[PDB]
């Protein structure tokens, strides 16, 4: 609690931003400036401290996480309901902006070569995780924030069935090489932007899907390089997918083979 408390009284609370919950706020910092920040308020099992040593310790951790692709924990706050405190991102989450992005008066076509540089992003940050062996349990383009700077950080990770691998579908594991599935399923969303992952299969239809071999489609403008990639993220044998810092590398080197 010492390190990631922050006392009630420096945060102020305003409007929804998606429903826990999330909601904008102002968090007063250390130098007297104001700072908007999101929080999500949790809803945990209280009839034990189990569910929030599990959150506190996290938390510790979380907010030791430094790398500009991957989001900033600010703190916790408590009201007796916990609140996590993360920095306010007016660009939104990188989901949405891609529908966007297929609208007028919205953002204009993403190119390609804007679209890669989206999964580096995310790569980058994932690669930063998996090295602490820190585990995301939700990796989706709904999670993916865009910074200011239009840089892409990853977010929800710690304390939606068509992301989750198959190995945990059935033995309902989690390895980094489940977040590896997550993302490959995250870099289908960039490549079609916005679509939803396996158009005319149902959620309860998923496991039999995947385990007669069947995966996501190739779209139409995606280079066979590209779901080369998303491809081997999707391997059965969680073994033979690719370690973040190999997919990292292959995306850069395949953006960089491209003009400007
Ligand atoms: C007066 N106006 C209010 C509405 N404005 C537009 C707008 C609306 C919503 C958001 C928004 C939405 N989510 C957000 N999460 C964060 N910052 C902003 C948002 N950081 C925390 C990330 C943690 C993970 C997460 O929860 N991922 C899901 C995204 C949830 C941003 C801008 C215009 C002005
Ligand atoms: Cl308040
Ligand atoms: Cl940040
Ligand atoms: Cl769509
Ligand atoms: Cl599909």
């Not at 190995?167 to 289908?188: C, H, I, N, P």
């Not at 149902?202 to 385990?211: F, G, K, P, R, S």
Request: with cysteine; hydrophobic share 40%.
């Amino acid at each position: 609690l010492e390190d990631v408390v922050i006392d009630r009284n420096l945060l102020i609370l305003g409007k929804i931003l998606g429903e826990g919950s999330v909601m904008e706020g102002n968090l007063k910092q250390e130098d007297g400036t104001s700072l908007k920040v999101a929080v999500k308020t949790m809803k945990l099992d209280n009839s034990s401290q189990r569910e929030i040593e599990e959150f506190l310790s996290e938390a510790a951790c979380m907010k030791d996480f430094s790398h500009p692709n991957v989001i900033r924990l600010l703190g916790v706050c408590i009201e007796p309901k916990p609140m996590v405190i993360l920095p306010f991102m007016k660009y939104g989450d990188l989901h949405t902006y891609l529908l966007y992005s297929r609208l007028e008066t919205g953002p204009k076509h993403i190119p390609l070569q804007t679209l890669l540089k989206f999964m580096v992003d995310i790569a980058l940050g994932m690669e930063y995780l998996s090295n602490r062996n820190f585990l995301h349990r939700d990796l989706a383009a709904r999670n993916c924030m865009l910074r200011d700077d239009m840089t892409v950080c990853v977010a929800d990770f710690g304390l939606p069935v068509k992301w989750i691998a198959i190995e945990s579908l059935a033995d309902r594991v989690y390895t980094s090489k489940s977040d590896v599935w997550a993302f490959g399923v995250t870099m289908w969303e960039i490549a079609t932007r916005g679509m939803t992952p396996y158009p005319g299969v149902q959620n309860h239809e998923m496991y039999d899907y995947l385990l007669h071999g069947h995966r996501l489609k190739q779209p139409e403008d995606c280079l066979d390089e590209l779901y080369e990639i998303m491809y081997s993220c999707w391997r059965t044998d969680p073994l033979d997918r690719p370690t973040f810092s190999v997919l990292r590398l292959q995306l850069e080197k395949l953006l960089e083979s491209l003009p400007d």
